[PDB]
Design a protein around this ligand. Structure first.
Ligand SMILES: [Mg+2]
Ligand SMILES: [Mg+2]
Ligand SMILES: [Mg+2]
Ligand SMILES: [Mg+2]
Ligand SMILES: [Mg+2]
Ligand SMILES: [Mg+2]
Ligand SMILES: [Mg+2]
Ligand SMILES: [Mg+2]
Ligand SMILES: [Mg+2]
Ligand SMILES: [Mg+2]
Ligand SMILES: [Mg+2]
Ligand SMILES: [Mg+2]
Ligand SMILES: [Mg+2]
Ligand SMILES: [Mg+2]
Ligand SMILES: [Mg+2]
Ligand SMILES: [Mg+2]
Ligand SMILES: [Mg+2]
Ligand SMILES: [Mg+2]
Ligand SMILES: [Mg+2]
Ligand SMILES: [Mg+2]
Ligand SMILES: [Mg+2]
Ligand SMILES: [Mg+2]
Lengths: 218, 88, 129
RNA sequence: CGUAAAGCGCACGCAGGCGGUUUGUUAAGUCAGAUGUGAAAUCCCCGGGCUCAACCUGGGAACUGCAUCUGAUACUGGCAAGCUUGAGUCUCGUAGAGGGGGGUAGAAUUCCAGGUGUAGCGGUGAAAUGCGUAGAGAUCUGGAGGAAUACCGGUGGCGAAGGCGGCCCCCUGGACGAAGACUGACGCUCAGGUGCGAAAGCGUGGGGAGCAAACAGGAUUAGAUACCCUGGUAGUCCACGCCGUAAACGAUGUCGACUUGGAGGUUGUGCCCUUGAGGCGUGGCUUCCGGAGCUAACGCGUUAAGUCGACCGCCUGGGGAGUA
């Protein structure tokens, strides 16, 4: 529900004209979002997300900035949905078949560490390849068990994650994004204006979303 | 361009009153006075081409206004040219 | 100088439609209202109004369907430099009748279909699709 | 028609084309109907006859036109009366290398006279020509003359374009702003025409410091009618007249309307005002980056090469040739 925070925006220099309807005014040289408009769109968004959740659909969270990199991971633990916390590899969805073998490599790499078959005297067998675990999971950690394309997309930044938006549009997956004053709309099927970098604003979004999917999933 | 006292004198002489400045007769009279005054300026400054271009605009503007007045009312136009002694 | 106000009326609608503006305003005239009325009946423009008496301004409430411009294409036909007159049988039809052409007949400004039914020709103002 | 062929170098303007808004009137253009005419054949449509076809033939349609008559009045035009938003005049201010004429100042180059002073100076990649023991160069003092205005100075300003930089005076053009008043379509464009139009060049009469085509010499080079060096005339400067051409370029004609934004420069202006080398508005001009759109692409992008309207100019493969 409507509460403090979030209303703050970025400097009027970097505002995007396409978002003129959703700006309530220019306060202290920084645009502030119209919360009275955000709530009807935000509340309806969870209604649709709940509806997709009721169909056992798969939601994928896209957060790359360090201000929310850990936040999205926490949501992935509260609910059983998937997420991206680091750089979005170019083409994670357009050529998911190409990325499938990368996931398989992680599984094989993950398996070796579990039973200790990687415990060999040679440093190459013990150190060089095990580091591929850290590299691979930091990028594909949340997508290991997706097993296919996602049925919906949740994006915390509509401009910093414009690569992710493009793939969803190409594949037709519905896109839900928190589009900021400077961000680019028209690439997302669902518009949720508000802050995209404030810690107290981002946590509310995924925390709010993480609940509805659980209710919809039942 | 033209002194305020000289400008005010022409408006009263040709216009309905001291406040009627837009009349076609006041406009023509004002232009005619300036063109006549500038005759001495270009008599000595023959090479002042840049200022001459401004003079030609007054000549062209006056002709445009004169033709409009003739179309609107020929009798009043005839008196105006007679008083100013132009169109020779 | 503005020598054909009608194209200004049509140009403003086309530019307004491209810019997704809710409405467009311009100086009002009896001819413009007649064209605006015809568009209103055909459903191309939601509504029109005239404000002011000494310098009336015509206001057209543009409409969009499924987020896209309703007026797909509007273009002036008769122009001051070249005016077009058509007889009853020569009345054109836009997009095989899907569109409408505003024709000014002796009975007033009306669509080509109305003029054809009334059996009257006249100036062809524009094609609207 | 920015770069492929194609926007006159830029303006002012007659003829011509086109023209804001309201009422009345006219019914020329326009539109509806009718009448006359638009030969036959041919084409075309439905039929008929040669065994079919070609061919022949009946009727119709067509002959998109012209003229009259009778009506319609939306639009254009004529006519009358209007109107103020286009255009223009007036009042008060502001900025500016806008133009013309005259005067004057400082730095400096060169030259001339003199003092001090002695063997080099100058120049180049190196060198020489050249200048100098007749005392150069260097340095100080005085005088003469010409040309250009350091710093300010800035994708800053002004002008139609070309273009315009010290300072002062006289004459003078335009732009822009503030409210107010006034005229009431007087407008836009423009073939022919006329005017302006860098530099070089030409005519006559002056001036001539510097620079410098031509020219001369010394180098470089296989040669060097060049690049480099030392000299140097026209010219560059002034008055008047002529020439009328430039990559005269934004390689983008003029005028008007419309269409997301961001950051600067420059020049007016309104408002809040004690919490000023402040805060929010409104005009003119101007630089840069970019959205939609447009474009062959590059790119352009509210100063369009976007969306439209009026008018003019111009292009039609390369060469021959902007030549005969
Ligand atoms: Mg004046
Ligand atoms: Mg070329
Ligand atoms: Mg070319
Ligand atoms: Mg002109
Ligand atoms: Mg008219
Ligand atoms: Mg008639
Ligand atoms: Mg016949
Ligand atoms: Mg037969
Ligand atoms: Mg026959
Ligand atoms: Mg009339
Ligand atoms: Mg001419
Ligand atoms: Mg010269
Ligand atoms: Mg000479
Ligand atoms: Mg001489
Ligand atoms: Mg030389
Ligand atoms: Mg030429
Ligand atoms: Mg240039
Ligand atoms: Mg050219
Ligand atoms: Mg040009
Ligand atoms: Mg740009
Ligand atoms: Mg020749
Ligand atoms: Mg030539």
């Amino acid at each position: 529900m409507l509460k403090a925070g979030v209303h703050f925006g970025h400097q009027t220099r970097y505002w995007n004209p396409k978002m003129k309807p959703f700006i309530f005014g220019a306060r202290n040289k920084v645009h502030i979002i119209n919360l009275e408009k955000t709530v009807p769109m935000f509340n309806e968004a969870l209604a649709e997300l709940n509806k997709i959740a009721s169909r056992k659909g798969k939601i994928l969270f896209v957060g790359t900035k360090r201000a929310a990199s850990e936040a999205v991971k926490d949501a992935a633990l509260s609910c059983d949905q998937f997420f991206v916390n680091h750089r979005w590899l170019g083409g994670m969805l357009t050529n998911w078949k190409t990325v499938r073998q990368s996931i398989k490599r992680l599984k094989d790499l993950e398996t070796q560490s579990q039973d200790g078959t990687f415990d060999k005297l040679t440093k190459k067998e013990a150190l060089m390849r095990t580091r591929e675990l850290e590299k691979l999971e930091n990028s594909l950690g949340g997508i290991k068990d997706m097993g296919g394309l996602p049925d919906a997309l949740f994006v915390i930044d509509a401009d910093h994650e414009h690569i992710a938006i493009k793939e969803a549009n190409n594949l037709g997956i519905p896109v839900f994004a928190i589009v900021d004053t400077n961000s680019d709309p028209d690439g997302v099927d669902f518009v949720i204006p508000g802050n995209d970098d404030a810690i107290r604003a981002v946590t509310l979004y995924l925390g709010a979303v993480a609940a509805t999917v659980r209710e919809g999933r039942s | 361009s033209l002194s305020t006292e000289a400008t005010a004198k022409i408006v009263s002489e040709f216009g309905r009153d001291a406040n009627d400045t837009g009349s076609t007769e006041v406009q023509v009279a004002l232009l005619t006075a300036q063109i006549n005054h500038l005759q001495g300026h270009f008599a000595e400054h023959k090479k002042d081409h840049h200022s001459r271009r401004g003079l030609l605009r007054m000549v062209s503007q006056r002709r445009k206004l004169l033709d409009y007045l003739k179309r609107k009312d020929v009798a009043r136009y005839t008196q105006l040219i007679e008083r100013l002694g132009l169109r020779r | 100088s503005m020598q054909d106000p009608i194209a200004d009326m049509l140009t403003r609608i086309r530019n307004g439609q491209a810019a997704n503006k809710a409405a467009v305003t311009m100086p009002s005239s009896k001819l413009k209202v007649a064209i605006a009325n015809v568009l209103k009946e055909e459903g191309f423009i939601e509504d029109f109004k005239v404000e002011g008496d000494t310098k009336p301004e015509l206001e057209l409430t543009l409409k969009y369907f499924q987020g896209k411009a309703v007026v797909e294409s509007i273009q002036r036909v008769s122009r001051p430099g070249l005016r077009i007159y058509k007889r009853k049988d020569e009345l054109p039809k836009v997009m095989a009748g899907l569109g409408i052409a505003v024709v000014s007949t002796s009975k007033g400004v009306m669509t080509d279909r109305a003029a054809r039914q009334a059996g009257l020709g006249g100036e062809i103002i524009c094609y609207v699709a």
